[PDB]
Design an enzyme around this catalytic site. Structure first.
Site, mmCIF file in Angstrom:
data_model
loop_
_atom_site.group_PDB
_atom_site.id
_atom_site.type_symbol
_atom_site.label_atom_id
_atom_site.label_comp_id
_atom_site.label_asym_id
_atom_site.label_seq_id
_atom_site.Cartn_x
_atom_site.Cartn_y
_atom_site.Cartn_z
ATOM 1 N N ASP B 146 0.792 -1.097 0.055
ATOM 2 C CA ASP B 146 0.131 0.017 0.000
ATOM 3 C C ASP B 146 0.948 1.191 0.155
ATOM 4 O O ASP B 146 0.547 2.218 -0.761
ATOM 5 C CB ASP B 146 -1.013 0.249 1.246
ATOM 6 C CG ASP B 146 -1.864 -1.339 1.340
ATOM 7 O OD1 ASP B 146 -2.153 -1.614 0.248
ATOM 8 O OD2 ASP B 146 -2.028 -1.591 2.285
ATOM 9 N N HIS B 173 -5.407 -3.186 5.569
ATOM 10 C CA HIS B 173 -4.767 -3.674 4.206
ATOM 11 C C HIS B 173 -5.804 -3.899 2.985
ATOM 12 O O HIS B 173 -5.330 -4.328 2.115
ATOM 13 C CB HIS B 173 -3.951 -4.965 4.649
ATOM 14 C CG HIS B 173 -3.169 -5.201 3.458
ATOM 15 N ND1 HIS B 173 -2.268 -4.520 2.891
ATOM 16 C CD2 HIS B 173 -2.988 -6.486 2.591
ATOM 17 C CE1 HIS B 173 -1.511 -5.139 1.805
ATOM 18 N NE2 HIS B 173 -1.841 -6.214 1.731
#
Lengths: 306, 305
Positions: B146, B173
Site C-alpha cells: 500500500d 490492508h
C-alpha cells in the site's frame, strides 16, 4: 533514454526478467512487455506500481508492434522453456516469425535471444534479417549469460571465493558439450583435474539439475531472468556510451563456427569488437575440437530452417 | 551474526518474486529457506542457488514446514491464494502455520502477507496465545504494498522522484481500511479532487491489477517487491539498525486491537509504536468511517481460532 522490449513476458523467465529490469534499468528508461497471453497488460500494471523511474507498458493481442516500436534492445523469451525435436518445432517457428517483424519495425535494435535452442535460434534470426536485407551482425546475440553466472557461482563455492567478484569466461555454444567454461583463465584460482571435470560437467548439465529438483514440474526461470537482466543492462549501458565487455553467442570472425560464444566489447552500435578468447589449456582445446561438429550442426539446422 | 529468512508459500507468484529479490538483496552471509506444498519448491531453491550472491538457499516441499522454520529469524508467510471457501482455506493455512511456528521458532519475527491480512494477523496472534508464546512485538501484517503504490502514484502525479517520495499509510490492508496520509507528503499540494482520486486508486489498486490480468491473477511481482522491502527492514533491525516502517501491528489500540502505523523496529521486533501525526479532516472522516469494518475483520479472525 533507451527502450527495452521483452517478448514472451508472461512466462516465468519473462516475469523474472521484467521485475529485475523495472528495478535496475537506468532512470528514464522505457520497458515494454509483449506476450499473446491475455495476462500481459496486467503483468505490466503489477510492475507499474513499483516506485522506480522506469516506465512500463504491457501488450497482449496478436501484434507485438507496440512493444517493438522504437525499441533499442529486444529481449526474446518467446516460446517454451526446456525431447529436442518438440522444443525445436515450437520455438523455431516462433523466433522466425518474430525476427520477420523485428526486421520491419526495429531493424536497428540489439536483439538478445533467450529462447532455446540458442545455438540454432540465433542463426534462424540472422537468416530472416538477411532476407529482409537489414542484417547487422553487430546487433544479434544469443544470450549465454546463464552459463557464465552458473560458472561463477560453482567456482566461487568450490574455492571459498566471493561469488560477486569471481570471473569465469565461457565460450562456444549454449547446450551440452558446446558449453565450454574456461576454468584455466580464472584469476588467482587453480583447479585439480577432477575439479575441472566435475565443474565442466555440472555447468554443462546445470539445467537438468534444476528440472530434477522440481520433480519435472518446471525449469530454471528465475536464474534465467537474472542472467538475461544482466545481459540486457550490459547492452543498455553500451548503447548509452560506456565500454562494456560481455560474453555472448555472436557472428564473429568464424574460426570455429559461423556463430560462436566469446568475449565482445559492446558499444553504441552493439558489437564494437570481437575479442579473442585467449589461451586455452589442453583440456579446453580438446573440449573445443570435440564439440565443433555438434555446434556447426546446430547452426546448419537453423540456416536450413529459413 | 547472519540471519535466516524463511519464505512460506515460496512456489507461488508472490513467493518466487520474493525469493528472487531476497537472494539478490539479503546481506552477505544470510540463509534463505523456501517452503511450499508444491512439489517444485526444492527446484525453485535450486534455480535460485545458481545466482552468484553470497546467500545460502534451500527448498522444501511437503505438508510440514519445520525444516524452513528451524532457526528462522524472519518468517514471511505468503501461502494460500488470492470467497467464503477461499477465506476458510487461507485462514486454515495461517492457523496451521502459526501452530508450527509456536513449536519450532517462537522467537522469530513473523510477517504475514497472506490475505486478508486484517484477519489473518489476529488468527496467528490467537494461535500463538493458546500456545503460550505470543510476543506482540514480533507479529506483523505486511502493508508495504500500500505504501509503495502510494509512493508511485503520488510521484507520477506531481512529477517527483519515485525513489524519494514518502507517503505514510495507516489503518488496514483492504478497501476502505487503507488510509494513505496524503496530507503528510512533503513538497507537494493536492487538490480535493486529487485527494479523492488517489485515495480511491490506492484503496482499489489490487482490483486494478486483477482486471488488467483479465481476471486470471492478481499482484505478485509488486507484492514480492513490497515483502522484500519489509523483510530486509526486519533483518536490518535484528542486526541492530534503527529502522522505521509501516506495518499492521498490535499497538496501543486507539482505533483497533491491530492497526497499521509507523513502528520503530529493533533487535526484538517492534521497539516502539510511533504516533502517525496530524490528520486532515478528510483523513479523520476516512479513519472514523473504517472502524466498524476493521474491527469486524479482526473479530472474524478471533472467531476462527
Amino acid at each position: 533514454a533507451m527502450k527495452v522490449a521483452v517478448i514472451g513476458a508472461a512466462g516465468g523467465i519473462g516475469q523474472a526478467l521484467a521485475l529485475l529490469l523495472k528495478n535496475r534499468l537506468p532512470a528514464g528508461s522505457d520497458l515494454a512487455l509483449y506476450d499473446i497471453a491475455p495476462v500481459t497488460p496486467g503483468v505490466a500494471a503489477d510492475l507499474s506500481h513499483i516506485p522506480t523511474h522506469v516506465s512500463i507498458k504491457g501488450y497482449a493481442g496478436e501484434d507485438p508492434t507496440p512493444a517493438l516500436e522504437g525499441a533499442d534492445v529486444v529481449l526474446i523469451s518467446a516460446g517454451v522453456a526446456r525431447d529436442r525435436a518438440d522444443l525445436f518445432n515450437v520455438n523455431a517457428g516462433i523466433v522466425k516469425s518474430l525476427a520477420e517483424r523485428i526486421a520491419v519495425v526495429c531493424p536497428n535494435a540489439c536483439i538478445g535471444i533467450i529462447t532455446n535452442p540458442v545455438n540454432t535460434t540465433v542463426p534462424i534470426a540472422a537468416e530472416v534479417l538477411k532476407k529482409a536485407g537489414v542484417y547487422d551482425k553487430r546487433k544479434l546475440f544469443g544470450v549465454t549469460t546463464l552459463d557464465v553466472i552458473r560458472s561463477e557461482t560453482f567456482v566461487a563455492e568450490l574455492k571459498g571465493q566471493d561469488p560477486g567478484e569471481v570471473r569465469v569466461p565461457v565460450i562456444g555454444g549454449h547446450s551440452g558439450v558446446t558449453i565450454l567454461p574456461l576454468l584455466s583463465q580464472v584469476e588467482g584460482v587453480e583447479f585439480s583435474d577432477e575439479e575441472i571435470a566435475a565443474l565442466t560437467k555440472r555447468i554443462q548439465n546445470a539445467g537438468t539439475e534444476v528440472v530434477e529438483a522440481k520433480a519435472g514440474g518446471g525449469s530454471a526461470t528465475l536464474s534465467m531472468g537474472q542472467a538475461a537482466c544482466r545481459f540486457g543492462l550490459a547492452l543498455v549501458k553500451a548503447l548509452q556510451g560506456e565500454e562494456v565487455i560481455e560474453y555472448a553467442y555472436v557472428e564473429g570472425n568464424g574460426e570455429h563456427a559461423s556463430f560462436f560464444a566469446q568475449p565482445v566489447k559492446l558499444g553504441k552500435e552493439g558489437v564494437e569488437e570481437i575479442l579473442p578468447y585467449g589461451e586455452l589449456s589442453d583440456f579446453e582445446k580438446a573440449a573445443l575440437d570435440g564439440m565443433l561438429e555438434t555446434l556447426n550442426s546446430d547452426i546448419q539446422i537453423g540456416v536450413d530452417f529459413v
